[PDB]
């Protein structure tokens, strides 16, 4: 029931300096660390209250690892350029996501290590944490190099080890927020768009985590073809927002019900305007 994920992005930019490296870390839907090589003074930095207590050896060590990783990813951009026979005048992007999922008992459910080059799958570690999926011939080169160098074995040792253990630590230190679901505050609004139709918009605000279902029914039947659903969006205070809307004949509003499923909710909600 929990996860830790790191997201690295490396972006070349010929004419605009060396490639930029950005890392962010999440536990579940909470960002807790950041690094940006373009900062006036680049350091791994806290982004959630509960990580701030980590001592100087954590921050100094994470900062050194990020600086090393930036350099390595700059090298890998140069290598990818050669694999793909691309020009040094073009801008390219490596994105890498890795981390671990744990169960309620705090043990490893699944480990992750996958990447993209210019927004297409490049190479991913498989669920066995022993093999790779390469998406093209360039990644097939990488795949052979990594088998020869026991890279999957190294990842596996991190993912089964430190990843799981530090996730456990963070979850304890930030238990008050990370292991507490915040149910949505919900309401329905009504907006006339003519003398014959109106919009019914079902709101969900201030919820955590991000996962939620909002649906509209008419006479107890799913209106999925006719519902305007917006992408779940950050409120900016670590909680999320979503709404769902339907256009209904003026006067027939009571035929419509909005249904809300969220983890922080003891029971699903049924709302009507």
């Amino acid at each position: 029931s929990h996860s830790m994920r790191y997201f690295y992005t490396a972006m070349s930019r010929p004419g605009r300096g060396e490639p930029r490296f950005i890392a962010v870390g999440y536990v579940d839907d909470t960002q807790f660390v950041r690094f940006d090589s373009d900062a006036a003074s680049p350091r791994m930095a806290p982004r959630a209250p509960w990580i701030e207590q980590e001592g100087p050896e954590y921050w100094d060590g994470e900062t050194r690892n990020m600086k090393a990783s930036a350099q390595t990813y700059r090298e890998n951009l140069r290598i990818a350029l050669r694999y793909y026979n691309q020009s040094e005048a073009g801008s390219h992007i490596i994105q890498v996501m890795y981390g671990c999922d744990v169960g309620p008992d705090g043990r490893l459910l699944r480990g992750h290590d996958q990447s993209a080059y210019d927004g297409k799958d490049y190479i991913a570690l498989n669920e066995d944490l022993s093999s790779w999926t390469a998406a093209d011939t360039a990644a097939q080169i990488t795949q052979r190099k990594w088998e020869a160098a026991r890279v999957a074995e190294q990842l596996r040792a991190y993912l089964e080890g430190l990843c799981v253990e530090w996730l456990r630590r963070y979850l304890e230190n930030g238990k008050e927020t990370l292991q507490r679901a915040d149910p949505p505050k919900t309401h329905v609004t009504h907006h006339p768009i003519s003398d014959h139709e109106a919009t019914l918009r079902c709101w969900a605000l201030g919820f955590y985590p991000a996962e939620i279902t909002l649906t509209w029914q008419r006479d107890g039947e799913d209106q999925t073809q006719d519902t305007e659903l917006v992408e779940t969006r950050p409120a900016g205070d670590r909680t999320f927002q979503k709404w769902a809307a339907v256009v209904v004949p003026s006067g027939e509003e009571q035929r419509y019900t909005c249904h809300v499923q969220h983890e922080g909710l003891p029971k699903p909600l049924t709302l009507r305007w």
Binding site: G25, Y58, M66, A68, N76, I79, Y98, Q154, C163
Partner: peptide, 9 residues
């Protein structure tokens, strides 16, 4: 915590 592993593609 992040991994220290450094690999070339």
């Amino acid at each position: 915590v992040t991994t220290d592993i450094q690999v070339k593609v």
